[PDB]
Amino acid sequence: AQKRSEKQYNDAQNEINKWQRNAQLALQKGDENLARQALERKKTYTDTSAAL
Amino acid sequence: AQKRSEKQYNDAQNEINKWQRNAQLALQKGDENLARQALERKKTYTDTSAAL
Amino acid sequence: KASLDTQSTQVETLKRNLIQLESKISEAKTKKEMLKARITTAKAQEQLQGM
Amino acid sequence: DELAALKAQMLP
Amino acid sequence: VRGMNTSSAMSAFERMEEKVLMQESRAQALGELAGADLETQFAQLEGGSDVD
């Protein structure tokens, strides 16, 4: 169970990184809306990771 | 039954010798952790042999 | 002609969807094979652990 | 104590 | 796409959970064997042998 949680935690970190790439891509694109979605996801994910 | 006990006692002595070799090997290896496991085994085995 | 254009557009959309659907089932099939492989490995581990 | 003994053995 | 409960999606999620759980369970069993000193001792000997 702990390993699954660790995997989930690892997945969350990976998910955050993927979201970060999108945010970086959005900046290059110059579209504000794409960037906003990524930021919200990072904050909730970080909180979940801390709890885990 | 006595013969079995004697065999067990002999086996314990043999087991201790095997553990001793590992401890000697650990010293050559230079790893402290391997040595610690061998020492604990020798003490309990010796007590068991004395009781037998 | 207008009807034909509408039909062609619908067919093209359907074809694109079908291709996407086709890609998805193949991936699932590949995943199933991978899943089966994982299961076999687990069975081997149990026998080894007991001995 | 065992660790200390091991260190002594290691030194030789 | 949705990942919502479905005839195919539900089955896939259940299947995914089972294999992951099995892998985690297998690892836990493996870890106990790994924890023992004797298994570790063999590896150290093997590494020296491999270099030679």
PDB file of all heavy atoms in Angstrom, chain D, unseen atoms left out:
ATOM      1  N   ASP D   1      29.270  -2.328  21.467  1.00  0.00           N
ATOM      2  CA  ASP D   1      30.497  -3.022  21.831  1.00  0.00           C
ATOM      3  C   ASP D   1      30.975  -3.886  20.669  1.00  0.00           C
ATOM      4  O   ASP D   1      32.170  -3.960  20.386  1.00  0.00           O
ATOM      5  CB  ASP D   1      30.270  -3.890  23.070  1.00  0.00           C
ATOM      6  N   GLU D   2      30.028  -4.539  20.000  1.00  0.00           N
ATOM      7  CA  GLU D   2      30.338  -5.396  18.863  1.00  0.00           C
ATOM      8  C   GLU D   2      30.955  -4.579  17.732  1.00  0.00           C
ATOM      9  O   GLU D   2      31.897  -5.026  17.078  1.00  0.00           O
ATOM     10  CB  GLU D   2      29.074  -6.100  18.368  1.00  0.00           C
ATOM     11  N   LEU D   3      30.419  -3.383  17.508  1.00  0.00           N
ATOM     12  CA  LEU D   3      30.928  -2.502  16.465  1.00  0.00           C
ATOM     13  C   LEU D   3      32.371  -2.112  16.765  1.00  0.00           C
ATOM     14  O   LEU D   3      33.212  -2.071  15.868  1.00  0.00           O
ATOM     15  CB  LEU D   3      30.059  -1.249  16.355  1.00  0.00           C
ATOM     16  N   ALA D   4      32.651  -1.827  18.035  1.00  0.00           N
ATOM     17  CA  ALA D   4      33.996  -1.457  18.459  1.00  0.00           C
ATOM     18  C   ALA D   4      34.953  -2.621  18.227  1.00  0.00           C
ATOM     19  O   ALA D   4      36.086  -2.427  17.784  1.00  0.00           O
ATOM     20  CB  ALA D   4      33.995  -1.054  19.925  1.00  0.00           C
ATOM     21  N   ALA D   5      34.489  -3.830  18.529  1.00  0.00           N
ATOM     22  CA  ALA D   5      35.289  -5.035  18.343  1.00  0.00           C
ATOM     23  C   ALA D   5      35.606  -5.233  16.864  1.00  0.00           C
ATOM     24  O   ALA D   5      36.720  -5.612  16.503  1.00  0.00           O
ATOM     25  CB  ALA D   5      34.555  -6.246  18.896  1.00  0.00           C
ATOM     26  N   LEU D   6      34.616  -4.974  16.014  1.00  0.00           N
ATOM     27  CA  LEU D   6      34.779  -5.111  14.572  1.00  0.00           C
ATOM     28  C   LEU D   6      35.834  -4.135  14.061  1.00  0.00           C
ATOM     29  O   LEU D   6      36.645  -4.479  13.201  1.00  0.00           O
ATOM     30  CB  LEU D   6      33.450  -4.859  13.860  1.00  0.00           C
ATOM     31  N   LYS D   7      35.818  -2.919  14.597  1.00  0.00           N
ATOM     32  CA  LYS D   7      36.775  -1.894  14.202  1.00  0.00           C
ATOM     33  C   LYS D   7      38.195  -2.329  14.547  1.00  0.00           C
ATOM     34  O   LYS D   7      39.124  -2.115  13.767  1.00  0.00           O
ATOM     35  CB  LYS D   7      36.449  -0.567  14.887  1.00  0.00           C
ATOM     36  N   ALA D   8      38.362  -2.939  15.718  1.00  0.00           N
ATOM     37  CA  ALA D   8      39.673  -3.410  16.148  1.00  0.00           C
ATOM     38  C   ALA D   8      40.177  -4.483  15.188  1.00  0.00           C
ATOM     39  O   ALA D   8      41.349  -4.493  14.813  1.00  0.00           O
ATOM     40  CB  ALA D   8      39.595  -3.961  17.563  1.00  0.00           C
ATOM     41  N   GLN D   9      39.280  -5.380  14.792  1.00  0.00           N
ATOM     42  CA  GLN D   9      39.611  -6.444  13.851  1.00  0.00           C
ATOM     43  C   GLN D   9      39.979  -5.850  12.495  1.00  0.00           C
ATOM     44  O   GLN D   9      40.907  -6.309  11.828  1.00  0.00           O
ATOM     45  CB  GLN D   9      38.435  -7.409  13.699  1.00  0.00           C
ATOM     46  N   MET D  10      39.235  -4.823  12.100  1.00  0.00           N
ATOM     47  CA  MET D  10      39.445  -4.140  10.830  1.00  0.00           C
ATOM     48  C   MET D  10      40.820  -3.484  10.768  1.00  0.00           C
ATOM     49  O   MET D  10      41.470  -3.491   9.722  1.00  0.00           O
ATOM     50  CB  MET D  10      38.361  -3.083  10.616  1.00  0.00           C
ATOM     51  N   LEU D  11      41.264  -2.917  11.886  1.00  0.00           N
ATOM     52  CA  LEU D  11      42.554  -2.240  11.924  1.00  0.00           C
ATOM     53  C   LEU D  11      43.693  -3.203  11.601  1.00  0.00           C
ATOM     54  O   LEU D  11      44.602  -2.853  10.848  1.00  0.00           O
ATOM     55  CB  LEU D  11      42.780  -1.608  13.298  1.00  0.00           C
ATOM     56  N   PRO D  12      43.651  -4.419  12.164  1.00  0.00           N
ATOM     57  CA  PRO D  12      44.711  -5.362  11.825  1.00  0.00           C
ATOM     58  C   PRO D  12      44.706  -5.798  10.358  1.00  0.00           C
ATOM     59  O   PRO D  12      43.667  -6.105   9.768  1.00  0.00           O
ATOM     60  CB  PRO D  12      44.501  -6.562  12.748  1.00  0.00           C
TER      61      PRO D  12
END
